[PDB]
Design a protein around this ligand. Structure first.
Ligand SMILES: Cc1ccccc1-c1n[nH]c2nc(Oc3ccc(F)cc3F)ncc12
Length: 339
């Protein structure tokens, strides 16, 4: 049965939410979008409520995409959907989408740690990533700011699935795999593993691994550590222009990671060497990384679940605004809360 909704001005828009949600207060000061913290009186959970959506074909498809992704994700280490609602009573008046998830304590930026803490945090990221990758979903933009923890350091991944904000000395680009940063090729799931390597290094040292002042400076930072590409990788760079530029660079050998990560657990150094490989074909996978000796005290093959199949055929589909809107409406209406 349809709950009673009440109205409140918050982020200079009128939020209309079910009575169960109380004490709504804006969080993140814009950083997360139009998001409010609230208390869910039905479940006793502190929740984050995001108000989004059908302004164009691209916007409507992106709205559908986000709802589909969030509805699929059912894993301890991945942000999932506690609720989704609209005050609209029919498809015709449907124009707002509200998404509800767990309210976390802080992101990984507001944390950066002992080796034991690093083990635990990276384990959880990899556990969540195994799940996400098993559904053929790539995050594409893993960074400390979309990794959040509660008070008990229990972690969840957020934001899975412009040129200006990627320009210059910016954290938005520091965690990106070189093949995606420079559009070398059609990339794979281990772009996310590169990101984990960058994050893990930063947890260990307290410092950004590749704090490039721009794309090129960052590539140079990367290649100084991992070496310039060999013949085999160059061949895989389908971008003739990008391949051409790479060959202009003075060749450099891979550095000794033990001399870069001075005093770190040798098993951590080993894992970093396996994650921070230039050739994405040869990077360690999430499933493989979980079985690495570094996570011996946390690893449990019976407690690292995979995802149900995820149908993303809609991605190659071209539809009208009202069609994406109708699809989105169906998904809102059919939502079943978690047990
Ligand atoms: C990342 C963080 C840092 C500090 C405090 C709270 C949070 C936080 N907890 N939950 C959060 N959810 C979001 O986005 C949503 C994602 C999916 C939703 F269904 C609803 C959302 F609001 N953004 C920040 C936080």
């Amino acid at each position: 049965e349809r709950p009673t909704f009440y109205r409140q001005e918050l982020n200079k828009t009128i939020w209309e939410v079910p009575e169960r949600y109380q004490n709504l207060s804006p969080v993140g000061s814009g950083a997360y979008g139009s998001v409010c913290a609230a208390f869910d009186t039905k479940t006793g959970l502190r929740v984050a409520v995001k108000k989004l959506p059908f302004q164009s074909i691209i916007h409507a498809k992106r709205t559908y995409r986000e709802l589909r992704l969030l509805k699929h994700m059912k894993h301890e280490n991945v942000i999932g959907l506690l609720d989704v609602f609209t005050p609209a009573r029919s498809l015709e008046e449907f124009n707002d989408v509200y998404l509800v998830t767990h309210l976390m304590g802080a992101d990984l930026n507001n944390i950066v740690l002992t080796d034991d803490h690093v083990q635990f945090l990276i384990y959880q990221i990899l556990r969540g990533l195994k799940y996400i990758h098993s559904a053929d979903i790539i995050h594409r933009d893993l960074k400390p700011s979309n990794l959040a923890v509660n008070e008990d350091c229990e972690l969840k991944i957020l934001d899975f699935g412009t040129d200006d904000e990627m320009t210059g000395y910016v954290a938005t680009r520091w965690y990106r795999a070189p093949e995606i940063m420079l559009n070398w090729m059609h990339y794979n799931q281990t772009v996310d593993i590169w990101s984990v390597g960058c994050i893990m290094a930063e947890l260990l040292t307290g410092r950004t691994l590749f704090p490039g002042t721009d794309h090129i400076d960052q590539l140079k930072l990367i290649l100084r550590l991992v070496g310039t590409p060999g013949a085999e990788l160059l061949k895989k760079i389908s971008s003739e222009s990008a391949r051409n530029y790479i060959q202009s660079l003075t060749q450099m050998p891979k550095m000794n990671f033990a001399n870069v990560f001075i005093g770190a657990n040798p098993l951590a150094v080993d894992l970093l060497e396996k994650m921070l490989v230039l050739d994405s074909d040869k990077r360690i996978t999430a499933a493989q990384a979980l079985a690495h000796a570094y996570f011996a005290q946390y690893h449990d093959p019976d407690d690292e679940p995979v995802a149900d199949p995820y149908d993303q055929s809609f991605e190659s589909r071209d539809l009208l605004i009202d069609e994406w809107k109708s699809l989105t409406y169906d998904e809102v209406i059919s939502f079943v809360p978690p047990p």
